[PDB]
Design a protein around this ligand. Structure first.
Ligand SMILES: [Mg+2]
Length: 402
């Protein structure tokens, strides 16, 4: 069984060109990613998820581009134009259906291309196979996007009117809702561009699950959020806004919503359906080197996440994707940790905020051995909020169960 999955970061990247080269490989199962060029190469045709979290201090606009038969296919873009010298993370992601030989990479706008260079924090590009193309009725995947210059109405459901992929029709662009056909464990994630305050709320069958808010005046930022949910047939999932409703991106900064089935109910081996999502609801100030506890479990299939510590511990060796979204009111750096009793830093994600509210994100594909821990660790920059209406969440799931 193919297991194509990678993550790479920047450390000593080659200079020049508009392709963003992530030169330092963290994970590269089947070696599809080329660290000398920045390009992922598809061997196994199918549906893949790609995502990036890139650190800037000025203006940055990025886009996930692909090629087929060497013909370039431009796509959505994501920008942060805060432009104040402080760490900002721009994020974006989408499902892509690929053929053998297709390539995928991140490109910067030659006019807005500032990417941090140094050791204080990291930028990451990740991708992994979701479903091989070879089934389709028993899969579920979508990436949809909001193509309009007019923002949603306050306190309303966010309609994504345009489809990038939706092969089962599980997202309905005329209602704005995803409806479950194949019951099981799903990942949902969004990246929404805005130039005024924006809160995005994710609903499941009429109940608010998580909320993430980002504040800005005039300049463009990306609000991100996501969660793993175990759904039954007929359940609905959708995004909405509250009184903070702005989704007006600048030119080149779009808004996307994706979801995909990871583990069907009643298929394969339950011991390998491993996924967790947990939020933080305690507001005690963190101290440097403290493990960040996410105490409230939304999902914890096979109980490999420990909410009382905040640590994931690997039972089933394999490739895992870890991700978080943290609300914050000041400067925040988090170390992503991997190891056993003595854990080691994989990356640090920093996102600074001056007298405002932010949501930041990071993610990583990691190969894990039985017994290895993965968790988030606090630094001296510890502004982290966890509350209804500004959540912080930590999630992880096994790639390639059966
Ligand atoms: Mg920020």
């Amino acid at each position: 069984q193919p297991r194509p999955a990678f993550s790479a970061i920047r450390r000593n990247p080659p200079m020049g060109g508009n392709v963003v080269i992530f030169d330092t490989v963290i994970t590269n199962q089947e070696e599809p990613y080329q660290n000398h060029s920045g390009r992922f190469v598809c061997t196994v045709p199918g549906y893949y998820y790609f995502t990036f979290q890139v650190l800037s201090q000025w203006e940055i606009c990025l886009s996930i581009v692909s090629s087929s038969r060497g013909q370039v296919r431009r796509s959505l873009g994501f920008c942060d134009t805060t432009n104040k010298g402080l760490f900002q993370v721009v994020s974006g992601g989408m499902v892509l259906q690929l053929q053998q030989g297709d390539q995928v990479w991140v490109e910067k706008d030659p006019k807005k291309g500032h990417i941090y260079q140094g050791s204080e924090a990291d930028s990451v590009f990740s991708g992994f196979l979701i479903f091989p193309s070879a089934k389709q009725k028993f899969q579920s995947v979508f990436t949809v996007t909001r193509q309009t210059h007019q923002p949603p109405a306050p306190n309303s459901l966010i309609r994504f009117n345009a489809v990038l992929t939706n092969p089962q029709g599980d997202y309905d662009t005329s209602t704005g809702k995803f409806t479950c056909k194949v019951p099981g464990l799903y990942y949902f994630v969004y990246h929404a561009s805005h130039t005024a305050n924006l809160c995005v709320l994710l609903y499941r069958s009429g109940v608010k699950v998580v909320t993430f808010c980002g504040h800005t005046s005039k300049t463009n930022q990306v609000n991100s959020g996501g969660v793993l949910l175990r759904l039954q047939v007929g359940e609905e999932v959708w995004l909405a806004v509250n009184d903070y409703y702005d989704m007006v991106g600048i030119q080149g900064s779009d808004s996307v919503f994706s979801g995909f089935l990871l583990f069907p109910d009643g298929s394969a081996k339950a011991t390998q359906k491993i996924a967790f999502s947990a939020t933080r609801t305690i507001n005690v100030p963190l101290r440097r080197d403290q493990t960040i506890r996410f105490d409230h479990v939304i999902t914890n299939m096979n109980n490999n996440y420990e909410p009382r510590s905040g640590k994931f511990t690997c039972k089933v060796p394999g490739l895992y994707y870890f991700t978080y979204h943290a609300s914050s009111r000041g400067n925040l750096c988090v170390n992503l940790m991997r190891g056993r009793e003595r854990a080691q830093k994989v990356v640090t994600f920093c996102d600074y905020a001056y007298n405002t509210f932010q949501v930041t994100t990071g993610g990583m594909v990691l190969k894990l051995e039985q017994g290895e821990n993965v968790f988030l660790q606090a630094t001296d920059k510890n502004s982290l909020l966890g509350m209804e209406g500004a959540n912080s969440i930590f999630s992880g799931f096994l790639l390639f169960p059966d």
